[PDB]
Amino acid sequence: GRRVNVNVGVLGHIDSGKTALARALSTTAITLDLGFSCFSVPLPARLRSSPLLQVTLVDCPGHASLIRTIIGGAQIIDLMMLVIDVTKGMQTQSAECLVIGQIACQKLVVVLNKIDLLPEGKRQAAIDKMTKKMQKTLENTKFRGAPIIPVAAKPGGAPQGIPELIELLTSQISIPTRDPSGPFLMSVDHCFSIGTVMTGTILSGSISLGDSVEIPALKVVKKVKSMQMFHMPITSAMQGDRLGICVTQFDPKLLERGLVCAPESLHTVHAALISVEKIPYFRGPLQTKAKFHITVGHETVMGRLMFFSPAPDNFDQEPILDSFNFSQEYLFQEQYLSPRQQWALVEFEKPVTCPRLCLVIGSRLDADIHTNTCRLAFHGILLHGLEDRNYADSFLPRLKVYKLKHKDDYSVQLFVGLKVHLSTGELGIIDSFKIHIPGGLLSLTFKRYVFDTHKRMVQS
Numbered sequence: 001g002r003r004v005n006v007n008v009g010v011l012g013h014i015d016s017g018k019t020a021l022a023r024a025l026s027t028t029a030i031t032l033d034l035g036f037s038c039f040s041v042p043l044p045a046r047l048r049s050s051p052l053l054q055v056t057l058v059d060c061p062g063h064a065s066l067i068r069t070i071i072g073g074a075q076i077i078d079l080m081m082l083v084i085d086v087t088k089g090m091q092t093q094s095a096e097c098l099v100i101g102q103i104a105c106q107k108l109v110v111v112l113n114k115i116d117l118l119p120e121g122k123r124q125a126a127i128d129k130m131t132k133k134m135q136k137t138l139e140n141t142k143f144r145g146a147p148i149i150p151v152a153a154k155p156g157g158a159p160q161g162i163p164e165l166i167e168l169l170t171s172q173i174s175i176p177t178r179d180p181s182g183p184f185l186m187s188v189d190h191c192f193s194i195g196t197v198m199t200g201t202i203l204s205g206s207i208s209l210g211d212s213v214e215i216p217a218l219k220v221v222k223k224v225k226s227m228q229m230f231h232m233p234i235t236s237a238m239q240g241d242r243l244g245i246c247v248t249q250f251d252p253k254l255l256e257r258g259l260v261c262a263p264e265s266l267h268t269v270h271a272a273l274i275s276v277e278k279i280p281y282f283r284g285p286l287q288t289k290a291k292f293h294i295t296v297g298h299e300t301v302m303g304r305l306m307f308f309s310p311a312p313d314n315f316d317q318e319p320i321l322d323s324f325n326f327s328q329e330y331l332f333q334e335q336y337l338s339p340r341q342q343w344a345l346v347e348f349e350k351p352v353t354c355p356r357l358c359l360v361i362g363s364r365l366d367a368d369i370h371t372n373t374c375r376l377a378f379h380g381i382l383l384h385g386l387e388d389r390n391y392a393d394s395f396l397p398r399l400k401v402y403k404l405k406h407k408d409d410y411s412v413q414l415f416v417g418l419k420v421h422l423s424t425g426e427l428g429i430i431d432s433f434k435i436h437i438p439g440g441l442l443s444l445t446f447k448r449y450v451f452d453t454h455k456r457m458v459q460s
């Protein structure tokens, strides 16, 4: 019968049960990169506004040096189930995976794994102790009271609590505005040749048979032949679905993971004007001109930044994260002021192709794998992306950020005219280090990028 695919993701620390829990699910129904499986339960009544539900279990690596795999693979998922070793506490990458889930998941389900690894007598009041504690950490977040089930996939190296798990799952899972509205975009999980195949997940818009599909790292753009999904050929598919796509002949090595868009939808940004909200759990400073690891899409590149804030006189300005208004002014600042809204401008090393208005996560991933504190610095919408390559001249001169810089009678290069104050209640103006004075006896605003045609010092 007819079906719906929905991507539940399994995220957690290393050796928390993810792969071991994804099996337990798929059956009663390591890990160096995203791995997909799928169980089915009869489709809930509520979901017919689109009979079987098919949960696709996106399995994620735990290894801290593979965070970028997660960040990408959390955009593929609707509901994220955070699996936590119950014996060990809430570990490091776990409390990172919670951040990622906040940034990119709509709903959450905490799982307490390794139940058996506990004193059968005290078995409960520990769960109820780990449960009560989990409530507390989640309190601060948008997943205020997400479910917290205890299970055990491998009672050693039959699994408990798993049938209970799926019914809690087949209830919290929630499909968004499943619009095959906008420009089509697909994350490709596996791509191989037989034609050439692309088992990927759709993110935006629809795609009918024989449509026009661009592959950017492939340098050309083939047309869709067949579309096998639920073991049976389809004539059209849209968001949320996991799909299979046969396109013109080509080779795979030209991609292994990445993006498949509409004919022209995607950018090729060299830099971008981005909404930047800082992540609280990140201890430390976000420093204007500091090269962070930056994840934009199923792609993650190196970028130095520069932060700023709305006018001083217009801080308390609503927070708009849909477009940028290049009319207003913005005071250039040295670090993320910790300004209802604060922006920044990332200038990459290599370029980064991205769907317009995609989320961005700045992070410092040169750190140890056994790191001490969260490594995810800031997230934030990509408010605008400079497509131009020589953009610093071509387009930035359209932004108005400046650095409030500060430093015989009636007459004590490019400052020859600016009214300067002196300490005794006087005016004064530069001239020929001579200074003509009104009557008888600097606070300029250099635009950050105006020199290109103005090198201004014009202050009022």
Ligand SMILES: Nc1nc2c(ncn2[C@@H]2O[C@H](COP(=O)(O)OP(=O)(O)NP(=O)(O)O)[C@@H](O)[C@H]2O)c(=O)[nH]1
Pocket: 013, 014, 015, 016, 017, 018, 019, 020, 021, 030, 031, 032, 060, 061, 062, 063, 113, 114, 115, 116, 117, 151, 152, 153, 154, 155, 156, 157
């Ligand atoms: N005691 C106990 N051990 C379990 C249970 N479930 C899984 N394990 C143990 O967890 C160990 C590592 O977990 P595993 O699922 O392999 O790793 P993972 O969840 O995929 N994370 P990663 O991707 O880094 O391997 C396994 O060797 C398995 O024996 C459980 O329910 N109880």
